[PDB]
């Protein structure tokens, strides 16, 4: 579930 949010 890595979300990334940059």
Same mark, same amino acid.
């Not at 579930?1 to 940059?6: D, E, G, I, Q, V």
């Given at each position: &579930? !890595?979300?990334? !949010? &940059?």
């Amino acid at each position: &579930h !890595r979300f990334l !949010r &940059h």
